[PDB]
Design a protein around this ligand. Structure first.
Ligand SMILES: Cc1cn(CCC(=O)O)c2ccccc12
Ligand SMILES: Cc1cn(CCC(=O)O)c2ccccc12
Ligand SMILES: Cc1cn(CCC(=O)O)c2ccccc12
Ligand SMILES: Cc1cn(CCC(=O)O)c2ccccc12
Ligand SMILES: Cc1cn(CCC(=O)O)c2ccccc12
Ligand SMILES: Cc1cn(CCC(=O)O)c2ccccc12
Lengths: 157, 153, 155, 155, 157, 153
């Protein structure tokens, strides 16, 4: 009955994210992808769009499910009877801030955070940089799942 | 006649800040906490909370500041800054400012890491966690914590 | 059935190590602590294993074994393909990242990193030995049984 | 025929920037300084270009142009495929690395990094403006013509 | 008449090195790979072996040549009428030490150092880690040029 | 009665070290340079070179040390260390030692960055460059530089 939560805004999900989802699904009995929403700032994609893009690119992972949430991550985790977070690392990750949040999350709720580095091929993509590059016409098709790329181009046009 | 300035926004002051205040006060004759000024607490409130938390430090005082930090320091006859380091400190930016401050006014900056127990609190993260109901009472002075609860509720 | 290996020299095991062991044992069905030996330290391999077993008596899904050679072979030979490594102040994280990417490339093994608790974040096996050698008190940073043994090796 | 682009907002150009411009112009047959504009600063694009040209008068193989949109398009449209970026204290190097790897992936453009001289390592456009705003003397960190103009904008 | 020196011990050359050689050869009129030797510590490969492995994997680069040296890098550079170094970055590079050496080299000889990050695929290989992995039987064949791999296995057996 | 210890191997002392010595001496009543002990110069030689370079600092003295640094500090009635930062400093290890030293003996560590001009010299790199004929005369006290040339030639 092991389990972990993979949190993020996923606006949109990238292949860097999916790599980490796959590793978590391979190493824990259940994985919940937590799409965390700030109710005070809209992203590019609505919550239902974000979830649909993740579901479409994780259909081969039977022990992974996707849910949205807001507020404290550790409450989302604990209310599902879990106490582990799995977070990806990429080039440009603010690791010091991730460490700060991990120590805080352990302090307030006893939840552990496990970090895993994404594959080198996917290590320089981020949701924000992919959106920025695509906005100005750059080809990011190789860094995003098919469930995302043309939806992204659609939002931009 | 030694002295140092401990600058920050302190909105609110944390035990991380207080730990560094205490070390500065133990190692310099005179310490001034500089409250540099759209946050949660007003300047006077921040000052009050720091004074309340530092009552046991006879050689420490608290003042608000505006403009160049080095001017704040120099206009009080000093030329040392003591700055704390915590998890999530942008140290590269701190170093840039330290070299700039030395260049323009001959003021030295001394960095000291806060205690491990208080190394992951920041004013911003404490407010965020408290806003969503998390317990940060172990990370703030007793007075501050009650005051924070007040601003929220 | 999930599982991970926690590798190190553990010469001696510290409370920083133990914290990570505990978190691994809480999150994986099986944990193996791999005591890695090189061609050299203060404690023998058997002594190190003994100290880890004493400190992890409450962890029934964790076991301790010695290992030699390629870490990913150690992992895969036991039917696992995850490594859990702790992070502390002074960890060469860039080198850990290099090794993690290498280990994934050559054997498909994943590496999960977890930061030890702030209280145990500045202890290391090497620094504890150095401080103890010159009479510093590191008893709050080591398991009780380890601290006793350490004094013995030094006196 | 070799060449590189040196991109930035240069609002205003600093001696840190100039040092890197000089090194680029010494090592490549052609250098283009790309003054990048966003939807916002102290100096207009034309003012920035003017200040860079004043400061680089002795560099005949360097020219200054404004740019918008995708940096790698700016580079490739001028028949080049190298970027030269400076490093200073406070540079977000991890983000620079991310962008370099992205820029290589999407367009085949290489990025070369060079550290500015220690004397100019703590100036940035933003910090110079901030210090000057409150009356600090940054004249040793900026070209003479830039310092004069800066005082003007503030007074 | 532009030019740069690409320095290292190259014991052995890796695909991370070759990527940087290729980028330097594409951006400078001439590139000299400097095989720097400590006369007080032998590596795994002799200087002639190192040079031969580099030459064999750079035959498609007409403006690159390979030479060995010792002592101060900036003397090697300046005695060839050049004043640029091109150095690669990978995962595990001690960048702070590289920066220190770059500032020192500029101070004492006026030589500039340009850093370039190796491709993600080659970002976790190093000569030392490749030797270590191969020593204990791990497969590093995809991280080294053909001119190296079996020579490496030969040294190890 | 303020004071700090500046520890290192100083083999030899550089202008980077001296810059930090000067700042420590300007901000603390009493400074002790601790020469901690197979290098190029003997302990006495290192001490001599530092004394010669710090003659203008009346409140600074130089002593050799062995064993725990915190014992050196505490046995002199102090509990502050001042440590310089340069390009290539292993800051993560410095932080580990600082937290350890606070834990075992209540000694604080204050870090200060050396001036940009002296930020890329280290004892080791200065010796290496000088060994192969490079000019490091701008990076070392005049006395030290001549002494170094002597050891080489
Ligand atoms: C690579 C990576 C980034 N993040 C942050 C996610 C975000 O903020 O959108 C992750 C979260 C979970 C798993 C992997 C990752
Ligand atoms: C722990 C800590 C952080 N900071 C900066 C906080 C800020 O810049 O607002 C400090 C400033 C003075 C003393 C201690 C600290
Ligand atoms: C905190 C920590 C350090 N290391 C490596 C230390 C060593 O090599 O002995 C670990 C290995 C496994 C779990 C936790 C840790
Ligand atoms: C020192 C330095 C900073 N940057 C970016 C600064 C900016 O974005 O304005 C550079 C760009 C080109 C060459 C040198 C530099
Ligand atoms: C990736 C990389 C590492 N290094 C150090 C070389 C070494 O020390 O063997 C390089 C040197 C030149 C070009 C690229 C590289
Ligand atoms: C610049 C600098 C480096 N270090 C450490 C050198 C060492 O640890 O040997 C210092 C120690 C005291 C004062 C200044 C410095």
């Amino acid at each position: 009955m092991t389990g972990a939560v993979c949190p993020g805004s996923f606006d949109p999900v990238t292949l860097g994210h999916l790599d980490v989802f796959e590793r978590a699904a391979a190493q824990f009995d259940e994985v919940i992808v937590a799409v965390l929403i700030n109710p005070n700032k809209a992203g590019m994609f609505t919550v239902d769009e974000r979830i649909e893009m993740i579901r479409e690119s994780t259909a081969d992972l039977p022990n992974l499910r996707v849910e949205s949430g807001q507020g404290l991550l550790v409450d989302f985790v604990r209310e599902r009877g879990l106490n582990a977070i799995v977070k990806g690392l990429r080039t440009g990750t603010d690791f010091e801030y991730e460490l700060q949040m991990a120590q805080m999350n352990k302090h307030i709720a006893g939840v552990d955070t496990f970090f895993v580095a994404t594959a080198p091929a996917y290590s320089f993509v981020s949701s924000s940089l992919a959106k920025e590059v695509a906005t100005y016409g750059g080809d990011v098709s190789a860094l995003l799942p098919a469930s995302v790329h043309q939806r992204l181009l659609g939002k931009l046009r």
